[PDB]
Ligand binder design. Structure first.
Ligand SMILES: *[C@@H]1O[C@H](CO)[C@@H](O[C@@H]2O[C@H](CO)[C@@H](O)[C@H](O)[C@H]2NC(C)=O)[C@H](O)[C@H]1NC(C)=O
Ligand SMILES: *[C@@H]1O[C@H](CO)[C@@H](O[C@@H]2O[C@H](CO)[C@@H](O)[C@H](O)[C@H]2NC(C)=O)[C@H](O)[C@H]1NC(C)=O
Ligand SMILES: *[C@@H]1O[C@H](CO)[C@@H](O)[C@H](O)[C@H]1NC(C)=O
Ligand SMILES: *[C@@H]1O[C@H](CO)[C@@H](O)[C@H](O)[C@H]1NC(C)=O
Lengths: 105, 99
């Protein structure tokens, strides 16, 4: 039903037939980014739950697949699986812990 | 001296029209669909083609069947060898059996 990601459709009557009006989702403006499959932190490999790791050139962010919305990489949106010596392309970056400033203060 | 049936159909008024798309231009379409699938995934079927590494868009497709994406990243060489062996088996099956 249409080209793109389908959202809605509306039927219209026609002589000896029917007419569909497909409402779809089309991405418009894209930008290049530097990506990584995993992030090494304290000897652990962090994979994103939903989204993809991207870089600004300097800093690293986690972003959903179909839209640009960079977030700070924490432990809430990542999960740990294995070590850093098995994933090809793993980069080095820190992962924020929300419990540390609450326990410090 | 060995007359074919094509000349009989030919002389009795039964002709065959050539197709509009030749075999050298179907292969260009399949090459475009192959180069769009490898380098972009499913992003070229919706809008513009968006580049993505193959080792990550294979992890996108393990998430669609209910498997976490660490399984691919911890077993990438095994899956690559299994795929290469599968293409070799298709090659042998097409080169051996004509049925
Ligand atoms: C990519 O974006 C990040 C955003 O965090 C930039 O990093 C700086 O981050 C601090 C916060 O710790 C901000 O106060 C600065 O304003 C940010 N700098 C800039 C220039 O925006 C990072 O610099 C960006 N990278 C590039 C190449 O622009
Ligand atoms: C899962 O199955 C695959 C078969 O596709 C196993 O891979 C083979 O493992 C044996 C181990 O003796 C090797 O000799 C073969 O060369 C492997 N085949 C390849 C690399 O194509 C794999 O070991 C199995 N996983 C397990 C048992 O954890
Ligand atoms: C990304 O980089 C390629 C490299 O040649 C360039 O052609 C392209 O214009 C860049 N931007 C986008 C949005 O793809
Ligand atoms: C990440 O850090 C470890 C040790 O801290 C180091 O061995 C490894 O080379 C680093 N990764 C890169 C890409 O330099």
């Amino acid at each position: 039903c249409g080209k793109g990601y389908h959202l809605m459709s509306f039927p219209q009557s026609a002589p000896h037939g029917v007419v569909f009006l497909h409402v779809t989702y089309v991405p418009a403006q894209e930008k290049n980014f530097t990506t990584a499959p995993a992030i090494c932190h304290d000897g652990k490999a962090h994979f994103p739950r939903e989204g993809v790791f991207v870089s600004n050139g300097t800093h690293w962010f986690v972003t959903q697949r179909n839209f640009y919305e960079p977030q700070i990489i924490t432990t809430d949106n990542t999960f740990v699986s294995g070590n850093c010596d098995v994933v090809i392309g793993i980069v080095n970056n820190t992962v924020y812990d929300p419990l540390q400033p609450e326990l410090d203060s | 001296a060995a007359r074919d049936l094509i000349c009989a159909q030919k002389f009795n008024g039964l002709t065959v029209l050539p197709p509009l798309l030749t075999d050298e231009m179907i292969a260009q379409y399949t090459s475009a669909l192959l180069a769009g699938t490898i380098t972009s995934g499913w992003t070229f079927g919706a809008g513009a083609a968006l580049q993505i590494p193959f080792a990550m868009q294979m992890a996108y497709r393990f998430n669609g069947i209910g498997v976490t994406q660490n399984v691919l990243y911890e077993n990438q060489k095994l899956i690559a060898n299994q795929f290469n062996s599968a293409i070799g088996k298709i090659q042998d099956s097409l080169s051996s059996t004509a049925s």
